[PDB]
Coordinates of N, CA and C in Angstrom, one line a residue:
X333 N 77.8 75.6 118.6 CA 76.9 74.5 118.7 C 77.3 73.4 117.8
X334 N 77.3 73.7 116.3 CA 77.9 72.5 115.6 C 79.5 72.8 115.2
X335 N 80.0 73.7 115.3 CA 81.1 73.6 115.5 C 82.2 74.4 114.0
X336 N 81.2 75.1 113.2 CA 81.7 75.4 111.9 C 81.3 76.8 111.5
X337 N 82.4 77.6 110.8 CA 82.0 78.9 110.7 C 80.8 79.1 109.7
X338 N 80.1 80.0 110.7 CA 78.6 80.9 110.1 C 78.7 81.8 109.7
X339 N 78.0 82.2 108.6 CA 78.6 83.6 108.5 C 77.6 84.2 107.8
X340 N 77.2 85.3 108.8 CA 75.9 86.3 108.1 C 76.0 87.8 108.1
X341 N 76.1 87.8 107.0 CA 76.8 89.3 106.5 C 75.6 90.1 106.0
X342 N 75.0 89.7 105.0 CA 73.9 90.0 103.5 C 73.0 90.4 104.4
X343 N 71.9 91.3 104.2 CA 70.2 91.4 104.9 C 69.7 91.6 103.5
X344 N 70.1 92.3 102.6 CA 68.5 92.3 101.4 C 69.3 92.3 100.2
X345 N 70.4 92.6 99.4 CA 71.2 92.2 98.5 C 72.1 90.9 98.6
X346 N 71.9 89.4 97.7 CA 72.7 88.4 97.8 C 71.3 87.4 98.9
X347 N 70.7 87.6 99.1 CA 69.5 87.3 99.8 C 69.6 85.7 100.2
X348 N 70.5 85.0 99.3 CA 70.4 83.7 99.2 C 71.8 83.1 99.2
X349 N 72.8 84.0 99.0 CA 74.1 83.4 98.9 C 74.5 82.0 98.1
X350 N 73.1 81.6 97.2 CA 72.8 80.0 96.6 C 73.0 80.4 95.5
X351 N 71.4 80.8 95.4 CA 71.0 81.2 94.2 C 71.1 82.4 93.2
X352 N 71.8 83.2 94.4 CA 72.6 84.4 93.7 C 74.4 84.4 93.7
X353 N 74.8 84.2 94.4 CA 76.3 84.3 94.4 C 77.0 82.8 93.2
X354 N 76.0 81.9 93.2 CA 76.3 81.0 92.3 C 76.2 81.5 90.8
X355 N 74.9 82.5 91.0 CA 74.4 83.4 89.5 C 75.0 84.5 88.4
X356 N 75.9 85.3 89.9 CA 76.6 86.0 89.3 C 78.2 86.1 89.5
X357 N 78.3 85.7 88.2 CA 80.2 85.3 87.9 C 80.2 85.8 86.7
X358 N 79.9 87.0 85.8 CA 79.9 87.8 84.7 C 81.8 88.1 84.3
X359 N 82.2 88.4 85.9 CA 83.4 89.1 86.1 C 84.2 87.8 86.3
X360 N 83.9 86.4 86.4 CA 84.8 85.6 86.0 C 85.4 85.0 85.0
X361 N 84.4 84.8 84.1 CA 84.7 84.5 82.5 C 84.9 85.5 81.4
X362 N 85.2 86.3 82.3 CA 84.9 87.6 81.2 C 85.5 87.4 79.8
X363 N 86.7 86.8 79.3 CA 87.5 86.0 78.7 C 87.2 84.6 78.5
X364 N 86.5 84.0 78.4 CA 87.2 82.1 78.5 C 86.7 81.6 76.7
X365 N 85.4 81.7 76.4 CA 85.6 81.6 74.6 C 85.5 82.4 73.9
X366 N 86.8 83.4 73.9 CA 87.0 85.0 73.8 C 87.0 84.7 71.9
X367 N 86.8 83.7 71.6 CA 86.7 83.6 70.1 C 85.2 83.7 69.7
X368 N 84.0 83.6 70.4 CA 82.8 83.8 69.6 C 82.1 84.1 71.0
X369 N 81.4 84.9 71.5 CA 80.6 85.5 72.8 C 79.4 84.8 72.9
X370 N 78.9 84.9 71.7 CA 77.5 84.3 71.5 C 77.6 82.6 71.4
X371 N 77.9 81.7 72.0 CA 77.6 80.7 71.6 C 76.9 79.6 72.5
X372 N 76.5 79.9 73.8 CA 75.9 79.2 74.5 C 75.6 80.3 76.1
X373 N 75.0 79.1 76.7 CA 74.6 79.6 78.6 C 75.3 79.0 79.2
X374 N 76.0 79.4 80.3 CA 77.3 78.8 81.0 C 76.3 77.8 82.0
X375 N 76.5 76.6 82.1 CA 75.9 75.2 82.6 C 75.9 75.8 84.5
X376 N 75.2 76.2 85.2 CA 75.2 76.1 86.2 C 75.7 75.1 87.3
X377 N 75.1 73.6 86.6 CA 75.7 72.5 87.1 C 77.0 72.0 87.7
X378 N 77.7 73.1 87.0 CA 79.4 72.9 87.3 C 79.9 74.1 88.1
X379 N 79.6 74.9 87.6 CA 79.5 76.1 88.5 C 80.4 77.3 88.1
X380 N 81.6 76.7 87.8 CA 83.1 77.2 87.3 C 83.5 77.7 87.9
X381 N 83.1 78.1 89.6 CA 83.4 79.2 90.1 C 84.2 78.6 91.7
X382 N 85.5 77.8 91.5 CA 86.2 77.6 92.2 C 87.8 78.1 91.7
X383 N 88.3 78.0 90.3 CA 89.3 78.6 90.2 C 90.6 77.4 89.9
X384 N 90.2 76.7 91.2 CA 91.4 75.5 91.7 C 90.8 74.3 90.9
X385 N 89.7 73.8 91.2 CA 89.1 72.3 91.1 C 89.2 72.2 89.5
X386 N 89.3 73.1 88.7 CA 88.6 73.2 87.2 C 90.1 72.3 86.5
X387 N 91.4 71.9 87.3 CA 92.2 72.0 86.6 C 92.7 70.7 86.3
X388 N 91.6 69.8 87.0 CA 92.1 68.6 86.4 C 90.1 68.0 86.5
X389 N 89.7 67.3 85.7 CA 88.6 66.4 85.9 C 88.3 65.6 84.5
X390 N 87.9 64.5 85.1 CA 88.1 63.3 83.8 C 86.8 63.8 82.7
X391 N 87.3 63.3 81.6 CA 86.4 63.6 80.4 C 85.0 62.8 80.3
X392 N 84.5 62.4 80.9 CA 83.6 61.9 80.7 C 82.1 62.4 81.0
X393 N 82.3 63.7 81.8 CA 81.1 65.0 81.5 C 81.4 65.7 81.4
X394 N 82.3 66.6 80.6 CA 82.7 67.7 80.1 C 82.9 67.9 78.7
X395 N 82.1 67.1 78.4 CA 81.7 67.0 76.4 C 80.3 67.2 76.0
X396 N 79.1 67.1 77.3 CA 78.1 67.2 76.2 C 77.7 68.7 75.7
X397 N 78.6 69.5 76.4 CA 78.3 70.8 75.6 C 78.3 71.1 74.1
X398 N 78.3 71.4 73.3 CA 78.4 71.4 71.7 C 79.6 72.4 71.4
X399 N 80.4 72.4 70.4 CA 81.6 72.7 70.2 C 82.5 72.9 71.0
X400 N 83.1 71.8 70.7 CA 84.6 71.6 71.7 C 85.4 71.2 70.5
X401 N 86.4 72.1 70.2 CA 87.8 71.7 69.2 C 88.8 71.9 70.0
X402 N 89.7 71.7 69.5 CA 91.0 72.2 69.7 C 91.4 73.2 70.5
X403 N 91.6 74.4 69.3 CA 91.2 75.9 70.1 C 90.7 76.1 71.0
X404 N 89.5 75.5 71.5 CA 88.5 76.0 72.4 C 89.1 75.3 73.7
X405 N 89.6 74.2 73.6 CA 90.2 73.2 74.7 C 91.3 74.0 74.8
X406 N 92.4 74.3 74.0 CA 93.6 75.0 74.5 C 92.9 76.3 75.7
X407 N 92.5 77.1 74.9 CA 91.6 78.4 75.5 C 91.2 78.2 77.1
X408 N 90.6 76.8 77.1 CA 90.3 76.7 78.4 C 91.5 76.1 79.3
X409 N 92.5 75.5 78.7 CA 93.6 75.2 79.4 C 94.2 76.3 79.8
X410 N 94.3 77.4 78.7 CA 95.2 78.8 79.4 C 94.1 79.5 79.7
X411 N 93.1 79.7 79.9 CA 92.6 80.7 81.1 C 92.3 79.2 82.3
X412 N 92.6 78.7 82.5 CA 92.4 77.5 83.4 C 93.8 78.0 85.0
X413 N 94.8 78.1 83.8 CA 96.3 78.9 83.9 C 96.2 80.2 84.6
X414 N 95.4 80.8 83.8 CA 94.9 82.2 84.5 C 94.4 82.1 85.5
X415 N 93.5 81.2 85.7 CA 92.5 81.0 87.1 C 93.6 80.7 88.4
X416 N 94.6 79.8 87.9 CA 95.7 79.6 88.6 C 96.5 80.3 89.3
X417 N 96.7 81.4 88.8 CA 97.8 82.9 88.4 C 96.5 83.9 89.1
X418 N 95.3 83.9 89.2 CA 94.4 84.6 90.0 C 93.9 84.3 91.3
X419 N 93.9 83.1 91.7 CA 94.1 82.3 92.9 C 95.3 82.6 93.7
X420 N 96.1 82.5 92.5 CA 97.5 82.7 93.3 C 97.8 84.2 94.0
X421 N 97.7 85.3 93.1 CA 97.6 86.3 93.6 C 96.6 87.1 94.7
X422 N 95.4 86.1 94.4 CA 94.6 86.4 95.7 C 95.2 85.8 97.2
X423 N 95.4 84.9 97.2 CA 96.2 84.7 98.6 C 97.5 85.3 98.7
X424 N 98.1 85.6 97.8 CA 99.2 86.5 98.0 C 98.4 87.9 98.8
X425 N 97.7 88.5 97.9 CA 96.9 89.1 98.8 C 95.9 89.0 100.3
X426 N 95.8 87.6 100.6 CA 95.1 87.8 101.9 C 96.0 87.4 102.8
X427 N 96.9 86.5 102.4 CA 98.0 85.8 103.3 C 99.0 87.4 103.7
X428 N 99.5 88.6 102.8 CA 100.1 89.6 102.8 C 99.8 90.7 103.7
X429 N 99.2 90.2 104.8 CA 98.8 91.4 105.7 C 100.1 92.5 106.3
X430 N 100.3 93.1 105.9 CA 101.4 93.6 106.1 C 101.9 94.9 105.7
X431 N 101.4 95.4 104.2 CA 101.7 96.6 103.7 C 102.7 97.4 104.3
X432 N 104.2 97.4 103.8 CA 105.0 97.6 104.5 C 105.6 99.2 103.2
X433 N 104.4 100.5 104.1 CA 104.9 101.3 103.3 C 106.3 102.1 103.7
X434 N 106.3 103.5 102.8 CA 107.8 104.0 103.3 C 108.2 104.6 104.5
X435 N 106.8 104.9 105.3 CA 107.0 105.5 106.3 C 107.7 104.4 107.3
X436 N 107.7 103.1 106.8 CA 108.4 101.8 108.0 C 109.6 101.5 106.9
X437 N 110.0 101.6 106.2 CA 111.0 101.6 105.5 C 112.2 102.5 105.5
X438 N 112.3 103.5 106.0 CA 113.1 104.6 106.2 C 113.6 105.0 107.6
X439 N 113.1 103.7 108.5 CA 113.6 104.2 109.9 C 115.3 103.2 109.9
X440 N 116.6 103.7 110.1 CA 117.5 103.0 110.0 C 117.7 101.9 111.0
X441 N 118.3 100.9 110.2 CA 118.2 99.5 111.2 C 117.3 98.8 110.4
X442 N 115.7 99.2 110.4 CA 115.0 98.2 109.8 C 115.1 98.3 108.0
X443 N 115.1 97.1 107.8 CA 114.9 96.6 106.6 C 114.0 95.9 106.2
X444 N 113.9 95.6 105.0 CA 113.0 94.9 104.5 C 112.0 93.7 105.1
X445 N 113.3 93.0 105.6 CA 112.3 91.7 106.3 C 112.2 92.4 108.5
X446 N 113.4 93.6 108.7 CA 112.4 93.9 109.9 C 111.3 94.9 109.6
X447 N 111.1 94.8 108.4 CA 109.9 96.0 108.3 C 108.5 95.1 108.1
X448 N 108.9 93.4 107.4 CA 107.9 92.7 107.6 C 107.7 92.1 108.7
X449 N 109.1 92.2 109.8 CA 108.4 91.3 111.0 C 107.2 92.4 111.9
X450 N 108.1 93.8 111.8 CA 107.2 94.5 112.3 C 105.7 94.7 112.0
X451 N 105.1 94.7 110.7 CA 103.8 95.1 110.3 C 103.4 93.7 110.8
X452 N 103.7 92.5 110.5 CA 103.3 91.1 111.1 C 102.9 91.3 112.4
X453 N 104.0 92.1 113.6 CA 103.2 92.6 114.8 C 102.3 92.8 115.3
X454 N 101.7 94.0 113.7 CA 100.4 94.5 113.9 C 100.1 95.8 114.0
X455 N 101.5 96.4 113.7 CA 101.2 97.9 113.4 C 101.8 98.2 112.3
X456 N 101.3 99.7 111.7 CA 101.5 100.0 110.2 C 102.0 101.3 110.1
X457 N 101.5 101.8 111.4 CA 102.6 103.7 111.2 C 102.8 104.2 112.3
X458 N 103.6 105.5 112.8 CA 104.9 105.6 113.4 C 103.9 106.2 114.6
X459 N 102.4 106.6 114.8 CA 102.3 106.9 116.5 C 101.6 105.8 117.4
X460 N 102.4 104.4 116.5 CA 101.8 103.4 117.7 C 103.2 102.9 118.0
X461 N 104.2 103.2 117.3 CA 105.3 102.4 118.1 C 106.1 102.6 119.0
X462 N 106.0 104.3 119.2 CA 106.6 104.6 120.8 C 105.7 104.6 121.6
X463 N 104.3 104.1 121.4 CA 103.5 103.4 122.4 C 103.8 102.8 123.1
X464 N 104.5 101.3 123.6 CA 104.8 100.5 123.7 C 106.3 100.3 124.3
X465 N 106.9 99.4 125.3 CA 108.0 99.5 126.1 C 108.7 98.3 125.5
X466 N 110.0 98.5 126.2 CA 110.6 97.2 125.9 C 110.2 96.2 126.3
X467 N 109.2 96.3 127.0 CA 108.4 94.6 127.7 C 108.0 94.3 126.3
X468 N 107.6 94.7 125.4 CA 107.1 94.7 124.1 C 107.8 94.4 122.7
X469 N 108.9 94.7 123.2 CA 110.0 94.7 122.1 C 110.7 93.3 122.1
X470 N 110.2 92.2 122.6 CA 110.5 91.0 122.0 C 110.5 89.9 121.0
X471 N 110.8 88.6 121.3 CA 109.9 87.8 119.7 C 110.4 88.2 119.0
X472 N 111.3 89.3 118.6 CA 112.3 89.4 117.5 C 113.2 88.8 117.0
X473 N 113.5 88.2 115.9 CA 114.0 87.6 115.1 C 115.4 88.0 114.6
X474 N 116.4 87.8 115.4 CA 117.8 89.0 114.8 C 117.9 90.2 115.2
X475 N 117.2 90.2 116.9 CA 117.1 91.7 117.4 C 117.3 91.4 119.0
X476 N 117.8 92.2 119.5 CA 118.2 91.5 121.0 C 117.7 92.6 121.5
X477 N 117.3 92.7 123.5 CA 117.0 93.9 124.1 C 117.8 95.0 124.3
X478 N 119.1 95.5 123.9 CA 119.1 96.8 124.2 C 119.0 97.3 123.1
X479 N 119.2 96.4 121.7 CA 118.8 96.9 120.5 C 117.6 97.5 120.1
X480 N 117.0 96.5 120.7 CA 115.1 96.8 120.7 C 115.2 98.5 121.4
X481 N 116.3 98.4 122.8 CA 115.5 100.1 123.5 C 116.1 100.8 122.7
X482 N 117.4 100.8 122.5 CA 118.3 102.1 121.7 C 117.4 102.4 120.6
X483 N 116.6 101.2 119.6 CA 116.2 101.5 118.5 C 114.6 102.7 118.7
X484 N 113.9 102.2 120.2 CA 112.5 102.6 120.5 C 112.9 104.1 121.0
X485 N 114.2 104.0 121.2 CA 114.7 105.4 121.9 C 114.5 106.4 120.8
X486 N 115.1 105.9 119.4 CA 115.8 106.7 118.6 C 114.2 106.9 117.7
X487 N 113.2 106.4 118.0 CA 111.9 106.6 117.3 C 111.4 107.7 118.4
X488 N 111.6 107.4 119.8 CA 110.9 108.4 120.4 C 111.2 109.5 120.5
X489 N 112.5 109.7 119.8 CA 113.3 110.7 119.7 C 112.6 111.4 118.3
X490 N 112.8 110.6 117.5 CA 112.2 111.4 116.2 C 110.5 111.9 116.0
X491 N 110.0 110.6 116.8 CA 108.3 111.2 116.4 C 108.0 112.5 118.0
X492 N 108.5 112.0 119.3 CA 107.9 112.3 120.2 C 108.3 113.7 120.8
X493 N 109.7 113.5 121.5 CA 110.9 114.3 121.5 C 111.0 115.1 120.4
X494 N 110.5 114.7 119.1 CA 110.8 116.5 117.7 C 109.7 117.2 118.0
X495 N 108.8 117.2 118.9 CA 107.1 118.1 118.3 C 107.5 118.2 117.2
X496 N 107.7 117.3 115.9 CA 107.3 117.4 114.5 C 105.9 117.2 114.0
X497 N 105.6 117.6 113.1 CA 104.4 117.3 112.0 C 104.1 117.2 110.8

């Protein structure tokens, strides 16, 4: 209808996705003025809870809080850093769909990057790949068709052809 993703997950915990997911970020700062715990209420206003935006904004509202020195501004520049470095690793993680364990790592021929084109495919372990025909076995990257069958052969040989378990 309007054209933008909706998204309704929550029925009776998070009730508000406003006024609670903005509330609780205990597990964000766990660290940030790791020099005295006790010294204030984190300003809602700002929110802190982007990660990215915190890492540049002009000085002209980020002082009326009471004790800001040195130390405390360095502190926030390096968990600022950290925020950085945990951003980063989270898309590393969501962008990383792939988990390329050893059961796709040990079949010979594939390596590393055809073990990532494979999981990129869309599969992750060995009784869906002699599913599939060489009509299937294209789109490869550094892999041509009788490579694709000799290689689908030599899988259906080991998973299908061994009755192993």
């Amino acid at each position: 209808l309007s054209g933008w993703e909706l998204n309704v997950m929550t029925v009776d915990d998070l009730q508000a996705k406003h006024q609670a997911e903005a509330h609780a970020a205990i597990d964000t700062f766990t660290k940030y003025l790791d020099i005295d715990e006790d010294f204030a209420t984190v300003l809602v206003e700002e929110g802190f809870s982007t990660l990215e935006e915190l890492a540049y904004v002009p000085m002209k509202e980020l002082l009326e809080i009471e004790g800001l020195d040195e130390p405390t501004v360095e502190a926030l520049r390096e968990r600022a850093k950290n925020a950085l470095a945990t951003i980063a690793q989270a898309q590393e993680e969501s962008l990383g769909d792939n988990k390329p364990a050893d059961d796709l790592l040990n079949l010979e021929g594939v390596d590393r990057d055809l073990a990532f084109k494979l999981a990129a495919r869309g599969v992750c372990t060995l009784e869906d790949l002699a599913e599939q025909g060489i009509d299937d076995l294209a789109d490869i990257e550094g892999l041509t068709d009788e490579k694709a069958g000799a290689l689908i052969m030599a899988a259906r040989n080991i998973c299908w052809f061994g009755d192993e378990a």
